């Protein structure tokens, strides 16, 4: 099974990042709210291009996640269904396999949502602008970002972000840089 460390990293992403309306389950409703929060954050127009593409990509993510995790087909994913699914993805990745396509889509969507300047690099102000809207404090965004970029030695490109992403969800190493991808963790 998942270690405490892995389980707790996985539950945080559930509670802090996927369950937008904080009712304790993930549903299409949570994706609709995520889109409005991003529109408000970055001032995107409703039914404009950015808005429409985000909606189309989020449907595909929700569809993948529902197919993977929604055991009882009630169109809602509970924390139990999430962890049940995650325990398999982690073993799966450990046996040389990919992470699910919906999860890779969500990783690329988030990189895009961070990199507002479109230069293929997340900078520290862009990183804190997104993560703060999820309730991550400024000091924990800056500490995470110092770790993720090696104190500015490493440019946090799409590919670097991708590798750090996989590390967050699957690593049981308390030293892995990707542990901090969603805000500084005290370990
Ligand atoms: Ca919810
Ligand atoms: Ca369900
Ligand atoms: Ca940028």
What phi-psi label fits residue 135: left (phi over 0), alpha (psi between -120 and 50 degrees) or beta? left
What is the 62 CA–ligand 1 centroid distance (Å)?
Answer: 12
The answer on whether 81 is annotated among ligand-binding residues is yes
The answer on whether 76 is annotated among ligand-binding residues is yes
User: Phi/psi at 172 (nearest 5 deg)?
Assistant: -105, 15
Residue 113's CB: how many other CB atoms inside 10 A?
Answer: 18
Report which secondary-structure segment, H or E, holds 74. none
Q: Count how many domains the chain has.
A: 1
Domain CATH for 66: 1.10.238.10
Q: Measure the CA–CA gap between 131 and 173, rounded to whole angstroms.
A: 23
CB neighbour list of residue 62: distance below 8 Å, 6 or more residues apart: 28, 31, 102
Angstrom resolution of this structure: 2.0
What is the 183 CA–ligand 3 centroid distance (Å)?
Answer: 18
The answer on whether 128 is annotated among ligand-binding residues is no
Q: Measure the CA–CA gap between 9 and 179, rounded to whole angstroms.
A: 8
**102, 64 Cβ separation under 8 angstroms:** yes
The answer on whether 1 is annotated among ligand-binding residues is no
Q: List the determination method.
A: X-ray
Q: Measure the CA–CA gap between 145 and 150, rounded to whole angstroms.
A: 8
Domain of 82?
A: 1-187
The residues with which 77 forms a beta bridge, in sequence order, are 26
| Shortest-distance ligand to the CA of residue 22 | 1
**How many C-alpha atoms does 53 have within 13 Å on its Cβ side?**
12
The answer on whether 142 is annotated among ligand-binding residues is no
């Amino acid at each position: 099974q998942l270690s405490d460390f892995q389980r707790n990293k996985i539950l945080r992403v559930f509670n802090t990042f996927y369950d937008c309306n904080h009712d304790g389950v993930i549903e299409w409703d949570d994706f609709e709210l995520a889109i409005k929060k991003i529109c408000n954050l970055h001032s995107w127009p409703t039914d404009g291009k950015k808005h429409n593409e985000a909606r189309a990509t989020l449907k595909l993510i929700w569809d993948g996640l529902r197919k993977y995790a929604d055991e009882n087909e009630d169109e809602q994913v509970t924390k139990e269904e999430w962890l049940k699914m995650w325990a398999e993805c982690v073993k799966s990745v450990e046996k040389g396999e990919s992470l699910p396509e919906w999860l890779t889509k969500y990783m690329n969507f988030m990189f895009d949502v961070n990199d507002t300047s479109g230069d293929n690099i997340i900078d520290k102000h862009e990183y804190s602008t997104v993560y703060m809207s999820y309730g991550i404090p400024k000091s924990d965004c800056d500490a995470a970002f110092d770790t993720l970029s090696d104190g500015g030695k490493t440019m946090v490109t799409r590919e670097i972000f991708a590798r750090l992403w996989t590390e967050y969800f699957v690593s049981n190493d308390r030293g892995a840089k990707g542990n901090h991808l969603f805000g500084d963790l005290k370990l």
